C-alpha cells in the first residue's frame, strides 16, 4: 500500500511512447530516458 501510495501521490508506460504521438516530444531533438 505504501509503495503504490508513493507512486500515486507524485506527479511523474512503455510500448506506447511512439504511439502516444513530452515523452514522445523529447525525440524531436534526440534524447531518450533509458529504462
Amino acid at each position: 500500500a505504501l509503495e503504490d501510495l508513493l507512486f500515486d501521490k507524485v506527479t511523474l508506460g512503455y510500448m506506447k511512447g511512439y504511439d502516444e504521438c513530452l515523452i514522445c516530444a523529447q525525440y524531436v531533438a534526440g534524447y531518450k530516458v533509458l529504462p
Binding site: 525525440y27 534526440g30 531518450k32 533509458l34
Partner: protein, 48 residues
C-alpha cells in the same frame, strides 16, 4: 561513431533515424502585383 574496430560487449544507444519527407504541399493564396513602377515614375526625389 566510436572510431575503433574492436568493441566491448554491451548494449549501446547510437544514432536515430528521422524519416525522410515525401510529397509536397502548397497553398500560397493569390495576391496582387506590387506597384513598383513608382520607383521609376515621375521625378527622382532628393535626399532632403
Amino acid at each position: 561513431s566510436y572510431g575503433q574496430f574492436d568493441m566491448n560487449s554491451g548494449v549501446y544507444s547510437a544514432s536515430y533515424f528521422n524519416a525522410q519527407p515525401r510529397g509536397y504541399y502548397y497553398v500560397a493564396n493569390e495576391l496582387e502585383e506590387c506597384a513598383l513602377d513608382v520607383l521609376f515614375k515621375n521625378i527622382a526625389p532628393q535626399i532632403a
